[PDB]
Design a protein that fits this description.
part of a larger assembly; 9 chains; A mainly alpha (104); B mainly alpha (117); C mainly alpha (115); D mainly alpha (91); E alpha/beta (205); F mainly beta (89); G alpha+beta (151); H alpha+beta (206); E: 205 residues; alpha/beta; five-stranded mixed beta sheet; two-stranded parallel ribbon; globular; H: 206 residues; alpha+beta; two-stranded antiparallel sheet; binds cardiolipin; binds the ligand CCCCCCCCCCCCCC(=O)SCCNC(=O)CCNC(=O)[C@@H](O)C(C)(C)COP(=O)(O)O; binds iron/sulfur cluster; binds FE2/S2 (inorganic) cluster; Complex1_LYR_dom (chain C); membrane (chain C); Complex1_LYR_NDUFA6_LYRM6 (chain C); NADH dehydrogenase [ubiquinone] 1 alpha subcomplex subunit 6 (chain C)
Chain lengths: 104, 117, 115, 91, 205, 89, 151, 206, 52
């Protein structure tokens, strides 16, 4: 909250990030983009939800999607992945079973 | 009644999606009508684009068309139809319906490869 | 024997010879811009003699695909020398300026070491 | 108990932050003990000594060479079009 | 049940089986063999001359929208007649799946570049040019991307040694970083970890 | 300096005519004063009654793997891991 | 064909460019004996000096398993190793001394060595199998010297 | 003479009628595990590792010394064959000392490789805590050999090598049962121009 | 990909930043120098995985 109070609302950060480095979604698909650079351009694609692995499907979270595709949307997407990672950390601290740590 | 945005940059909204989809589907039929009838790709593309053309002609609303097709939003349907039109133009020259251009070499697809056998 | 393969940039030997001569012409034009820019202790005539020796040690090959692969690699070194894309430490690697030469007679090879 | 500024500077900091302030710095009272009792890791599903054999638990031997699908259809054979998976709308 | 053994997906197996037979029906000329490996992954072994249309088909068909090409991997097998093999890994977002398209290439035989289909290959085949040394025809920019500028040979070829052929040091009579023949201070101790008893009876056939 | 001419427990010392003693004019030679042989023969052998005995290093899980030594042969039987000597009267 | 828009880089190209694209799309006749020594990037000294041994690897005599015997392999001739004067390791100036390349048949390794221009030789051929009869009744025999004295 | 047909691992193969199960198995390519079968020595049935299940039989057969007949279907990768191998070598490994880091045969020991392939994953031996495994004294067999008789698995390869190929009969099998020791009865030296091969013929490295 | 032995036959690592640095040529074009500096950051790209 303190880091976002300094960085996110500022006019210099907006003028240095917004409408800069705009990548279209068909260029993102054709050039083989993955992750936040897919998610910042409006494409709803997170590998933790579509093809789940290693108990991501017993925990619940939100997938942040950008709109414009510039630097500001990707920065806000990274901060929202930070907060949803805090949510998944909360759920994993809430429930864990007692048992072995490795395969037998 | 119009979509404000697609939620997806690089693709603006379409003023007349139905006529663009119908024109692309008619051009796909015109490109596939030159294919031989024994080729299975012609039959599969004709079945696909006939089903999609019946879905476009049956539904006049945009979001009803997007729900009835079920693939996605209608601009991505225009993108898919354009890509399949480019494919149907290219596969007349690529000539896929014939036999194998190159036979299998000896021990080409054997794993593990170091065995005597 | 006989084999039907896809060619690389040339069908017969004459086109590959023309591409090798085009490499020699382009390297000849690129040598005086290499000398004045790269800060190397080699005279232009020594650079052209080294270019001649690099072509001479590849005169012996006969296969057109091998010749055209050599043409492609020489064009890559030319493109890495038109744009500077390199340092002076890598340009002098053709001359082998740091390796002390080894004798070829059997007595000196017997005296020095088993190699 | 914990080292901080006097509450006048704390109220000045809470006014300038725009929110109530929780201490970012860790303390010995808020953390767990460095010396803990010695733990016992429980056994897994197949440390039972009676029932298990390795032949029913060997995942490395249950793999197979990859299946030629045209040959499999030819051996086992003697509507909507086939999709690679479920349709997901990323639009 | 069996908690140690990994449980596969039956519906993914059925969907990839139907799509693999669909691909083998659609392109009888270029598709050589369609297989479905363990772990629910489809491998479409193709002819070299079908390197460019099949991916284009997998870019542009309505049941094959493999929009992302995530990487191209090269495997060097020296025992085969055509030495290298080239593996294209494609991801479909619409149908939420992956496919592998495998082809074979000699040390001198070209491959037609997939840069007209997928632009990510604009560097990826360059890596296959640098690591293995296969020429990609109709490439917009084919250069060495990962190795040295004065480097000779291709590293991840199995004929190339692990430690290379040359080393670099600094030399004061030339005031330059110079190139010397390779001498290790301690050699790479090769360990013989070959299995003397076979473990998997299903892979000898 | 006597650490240059000192012999380690592996029986290694550099000769007086060797050039490799020129590395020790600025850094002293490290010879371990605790030889394992002397500190393993300082430990007296353990007298046992049973025909076979078990050794585990004297620490449990922190020692060596547990091995069984036969004591029917007369003499001192040496554990191959830790060097402890057992004897049966 | 299709009545759509034609490709502009093929219609507007010169007849010399149409002949250039069709000749590279064909198949040329080459000899199958191809020397690839200048292409592989090996220094010429290792080409003219090193000798390559194609062999089936020896079975470990203390072990009954023959799975590691089941391949052929290429290995390079052992050069001089030495002790470094600092600390006592085994320094070696041979870059190719640590490379064993697996192969299925000696003909494949011979063609690979002719491709890469190495000076190749085969140490030994494939071992023929001799039919030896083994059964338990020979151990207990009547007027035979093969009667066992153990057990 | 004629060749009889046997179906080894559901693969038909024509064999000489004097051949056993293991020779037909090595003919088709499959390696049946062994500890006492050496092809230059006499056959024996004492390690019991080579048990395979043939069809319409109540008990598994030892593949090293059971000659084949016409119409047999031998299943090497069967469930009963793997269960028999795991049980037999679990019996082999209940009394083996924990000497692998101080054993020179380790890294090429037959018992380690045959535990990693066709072996169990964990020891079922509860009695390591109390009334534990055996230990036998070392015999001064010679100055060329180093004998640790606790690691011996009683496979009788050295005794067959002495009485068959080496010629002298100094090696022997003393004792009865679990206290059986494979060594000379007195403090003797086993001397032959061929004692080094005994180190080759010991599968465990006693 | 594995040949069944103790070692992997070939392991290829797909760098997430490889395609991003590939499309840097189109994304960063017609921009300011300071705009190129921010763009390089916006693609996340440590070059250990890119260089492999
Ligand atoms: C918005 C603006 C708000 C402005 C508010 C102004 C009024 C309040 C104020 O000044 O408070 C600060 C301070 C006390 O409030 P504080 O911040 O709660 O105390 C500090 C910690 O809480 C102390 O916590 P602690 O328990 O850890 O204390 C240990 C010790 C820690 O000790 C050290 O850090 C030692 C090293 C520094 C001092 C070295 C010796 C200096 C003298 C020689 O703390 C101190 O020594 C604190 C006193 C420091 C005195 C001044 C230091 C030198 C200043 C030189 C320039 C003037 O007051 C003053 O410094 C001035 C008091 C009034 C004037 C009389 C003295 C002159
Ligand atoms: C200043 C730095 C100087 C750098 C020198 C290094 C330049 C790169 C050298 C190379 O490109 S080596 C590859 C050259 N290619 C060939 O030699 C192809 C085969 N050559 C031939 O067949 C020759 O017979 C020519 C070159 C056709 C001569 O034959 P003429 O007789 O008909
Ligand atoms: S005989 Fe084999 S299993 Fe036993 S201690 Fe030696 S290496 Fe280990
Ligand atoms: S000493 Fe070795 S060869 Fe002799 S019976 Fe024991 S394990 Fe077998
Ligand atoms: S190998 Fe058959 S019982 Fe020993
Ligand atoms: Zn001990």
């Amino acid at each position: 909250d303190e880091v976002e109070d300094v960085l996110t609302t500022n006019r210099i950060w907006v003028q240095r990030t917004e409408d800069i480095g705009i990548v279209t979604a068909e260029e993102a698909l054709n050039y083989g983009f993955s992750g936040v650079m897919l998610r910042g351009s409006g494409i709803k694609w997170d590998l933790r939800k579509q093809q789940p692995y290693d108990a991501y499907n017993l925990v619940n979270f939100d997938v942040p999607i950008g709109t414009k595709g510039d630097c500001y949307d990707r920065y806000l997407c990274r901060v929202e992945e930070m907060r949803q990672s805090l949510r998944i950390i909360d759920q994993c601290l809430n429930q864990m079973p007692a048992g072995e740590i490795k395969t037998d | 009644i119009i979509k404000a945005s697609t939620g997806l940059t690089g693709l603006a909204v379409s003023t007349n999606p139905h006529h663009t989809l119908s024109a692309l589907y008619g051009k796909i039929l015109r490109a596939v009508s030159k294919m031989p009838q024994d080729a299975s790709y012609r039959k599969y593309t004709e079945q696909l684009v006939k089903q999609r053309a019946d879905s476009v002609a049956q539904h006049k609303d945009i979001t009803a068309l997007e729900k009835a097709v079920g693939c996605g939003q209608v601009e991505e349907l225009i993108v898919q139809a354009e890509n399949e039109l480019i494919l149907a133009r290219k596969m007349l020259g690529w000539k896929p319906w014939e036999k194998l251009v190159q036979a299998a070499p000896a021990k080409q697809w054997d794993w593990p490869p170091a065995q005597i056998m | 024997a006989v084999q039907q393969v896809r060619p690389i940039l040339s069908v017969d030997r004459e086109e590959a010879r023309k591409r090798a001569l085009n490499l020699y012409k382009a390297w000849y034009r690129q040598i005086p811009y290499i000398v004045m820019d790269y800060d190397i202790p080699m005279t232009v005539e020594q650079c052209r003699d080294k270019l001649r020796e690099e072509f001479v040690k590849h005169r012996n090959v006969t296969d057109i695909r091998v010749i055209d692969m050599l043409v492609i690699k020489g064009q890559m070194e030319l493109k890495e020398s038109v744009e500077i894309w390199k340092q002076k430490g890598h340009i002098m690697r053709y001359w082998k300026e740091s390796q002390d030469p080894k004798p070829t007679d059997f007595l000196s090879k017997f005296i020095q070491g088993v190699n | 108990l914990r080292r901080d500024v006097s509450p006048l500077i704390q109220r000045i900091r809470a006014f300038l932050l725009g929110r109530e302030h929780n201490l970012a710095l860790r303390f010995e009272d808020g953390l767990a003990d460095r010396t803990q009792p010695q733990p016992e890791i429980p056994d897994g599903p197949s440390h039972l000594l009676s029932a298990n054999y390795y032949c029913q638990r060997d995942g490395r031997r249950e793999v197979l060479p990859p299946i030629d699908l045209v040959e499999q259809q030819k051996q086992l054979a003697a509507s909507k079009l086939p999709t690679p998976g479920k349709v997901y709308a990323w639009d | 049940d069996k908690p140690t053994v990994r449980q596969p997906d039956a519906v993914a197996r059925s969907h990839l089986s139907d799509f693999g037979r669909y691909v083998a029906e659609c392109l009888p000329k270029y598709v050589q063999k369609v297989q479905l490996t363990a772990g629910d992954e489809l491998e479409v072994l193709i002819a070299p001359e079908g390197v460019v249309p099949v991916l284009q088909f997998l870019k542009d068909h309505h049941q094959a929208q493999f929009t992302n090409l995530v990487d191209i991997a090269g495997v060097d097998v020296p025992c085969r007649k055509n030495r290298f093999e080239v593996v294209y890994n494609l991801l479909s977002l619409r149908y939420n799946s992956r496919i592998r398209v495998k082809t074979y290439t000699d040390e001198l035989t070209p491959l037609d570049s997939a840069c007209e289909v997928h632009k990510a290959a604009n560097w990826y085949e360059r890596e296959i040019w640098d690591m293995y040394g296969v020429f990609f025809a109709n490439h917009p920019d084919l250069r060495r991307i990962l190795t040295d500028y004065g480097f000779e040979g291709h590293p991840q070829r199995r004929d190339f040694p692990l430690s290379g052929y040359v080393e670099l040091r600094y030399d004061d009579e030339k005031k330059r970083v110079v190139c010397e023949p390779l001498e290790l201070a301690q050699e790479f101790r090769k360990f013989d970890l070959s299995a003397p008893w076979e473990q998997f009876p299903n892979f000898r056939n | 300096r006597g650490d240059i001419e000192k012999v380690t427990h592996t029986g290694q010392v550099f000769d007086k005519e060797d050039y490799r003693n020129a590395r020790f004019v600025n850094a002293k030679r490290y010879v371990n004063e605790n030889w394992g042989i002397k500190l393993i023969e300082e430990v007296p052998p353990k007298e046992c009654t049973e025909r076979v005995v078990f050794c585990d290093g004297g620490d449990g899980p922190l020692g060596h793997p547990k091995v069984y030594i036969n004591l029917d042969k007369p003499g001192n039987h040496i554990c191959g891991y830790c060097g402890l000597r057992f004897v049966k009267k | 064909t299709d009545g759509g828009p034609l490709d502009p880089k093929t219609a507007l190209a010169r007849p010399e460019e149409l002949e250039q694209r069709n000749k590279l799309s064909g198949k040329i006749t080459v000899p199958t004996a191809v020397n690839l020594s200048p292409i592989s990037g090996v220094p010429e000294e290792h080409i003219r000096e090193r000798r390559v041994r194609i062999h089936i690897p020896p079975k470990n005599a203390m072990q009954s398993g023959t799975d590691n015997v089941n391949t052929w392999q290429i290995e390079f001739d052992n050069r001089e190793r030495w002790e470094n004067p600092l600390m006592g390791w085994a320094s070696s100036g041979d870059p190719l001394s640590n490379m064993n390349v697996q192969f299925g048949s000696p003909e494949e390794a011979i063609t690979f060595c002719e491709r890469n221009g190495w000076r190749w030789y085969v140490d030994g051929a494939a071992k023929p199998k001799k039919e030896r009869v083994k059964n338990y009744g020979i151990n207990f025999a009547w007027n035979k010297r093969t009667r066992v004295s153990t057990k | 003479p004629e060749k009889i047909e046997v179906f080894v691992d559901d693969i038909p193969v024509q064999v000489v009628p004097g051949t056993t199960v293991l020779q037909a198995a090595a003919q088709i390519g499959v390696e049946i595990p062994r500890f006492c079968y050496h092809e230059r020595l006499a056959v024996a049935g004492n390690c019991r590792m080579c048990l395979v299940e043939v069809e319409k039989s109540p008990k598994p057969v030892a593949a090293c010394a059971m000659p084949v007949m016409k119409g047999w279907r031998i299943k090497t990768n069967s469930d009963l064959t793997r269960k028999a191998r795991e049980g037999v070598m679990e019996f082999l490994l209940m009394n083996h000392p924990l000497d692998c880091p101080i054993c020179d045969q380790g890294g090429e020991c037959d018992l380690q490789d045959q535990a990693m392939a066709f072996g169990s994953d964990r020891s079922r031996f509860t009695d390591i805590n109390y009334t534990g495994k055996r230990a036998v004294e070392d015999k001064d067999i010679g100055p060329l050999v180093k004998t640790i008789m606790t690691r011996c698995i009683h496979c009788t390869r050295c005794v067959r090598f002495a009485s068959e190929i080496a010629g002298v009969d100094d090696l022997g099998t003393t004792g009865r049962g679990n206290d059986m020791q494979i060594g000379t009865y007195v403090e003797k030296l086993f001397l032959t121009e061929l004692s080094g091969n005994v180190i080759d013929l010991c599968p465990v490295g006693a | 990909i594995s040949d069944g032995s103790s070692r992997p036959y070939r392991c290829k690592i797909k760098a997430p930043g490889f395609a991003h640095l590939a499309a840097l040529e189109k994304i960063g074009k017609q921009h300011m120098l300071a705009d190129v500096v921010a763009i390089i950051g916006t693609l996340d790209v440590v070059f250990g995985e890119i260089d492999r």
